[PDB]
Amino acid sequence: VRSLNCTLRDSQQKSLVMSGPYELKALHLQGQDMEQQVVFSMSFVQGEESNDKIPVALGLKEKNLYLSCVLKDDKPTLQLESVDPKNYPKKKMEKRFVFNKIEINNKLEFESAQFPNWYISTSQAENMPVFLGGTKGGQDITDFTMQFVSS
Template identity: 30%
Template structure:
């Protein structure tokens, strides 16, 4: 499934992270340790990441259900009025190790402090892990299970797990059910989403 429409938000995101790379490690200040920046907090390497911040998006399925956290599980429901304040925005950074034209995005919530992982045990299972998305940007192997190929058809978007081809991010047709993964497109699960930058 290939994107048929140019997504200007994604062009901007990939240009920011990939075409304005900081200078090579060997030309940086002597006290700038790349391993600290990769394994530690983004704050440990402000020269490198200060201008590169994740993008944040409001995501809703085609039934207009929003994402929110319930006991550290990401679920989808219709949020209105005061409840709208608990809606989770999806945070994204590009995966620079995968094919750019497929729009590989590392997805998270909570401002990028929790990643949406498909797991790596052979059977895909969506779960939240405490990671920093900006750190995953530097990690090829670790980032793949948090990466989804985004396809845009001009009105809705779909998200295919990079580590599990054919598995897509989905919501249930019922409310208050966990966000999960499915191979059954267009059947009992919703795999098309409205995805608007915030």
């Protein structure tokens, strides 16, 4: 399986960082303070692809931790999950871990492969958790930019 390291920034220029062991938060960060920003290892997995839709898995660079989508209280929820450090990543990643990376005019959107039309979203306010939102349209942010970082 092929990967690439990168950071994501929401369309409002908020950066993502590790809240506790299993949460991500988005805040406006600038300076050497930028160092506290999570670096993902984006893997190109198997699934349904288009010129526009590419299935990926998002893990933390060097941590056996992956974003996954699961129901919690009858609603799709984004969480960080630990995986056996020896079996991952894989090309055929379980569905809960797959997002469709959609390119939309220089911006990306990450939709859950498991919950159609649920996207990785951030809040307009500072310091709130990154979550799975089912609505696109003026409120929560569902678009990001990506920056390549080195291997």
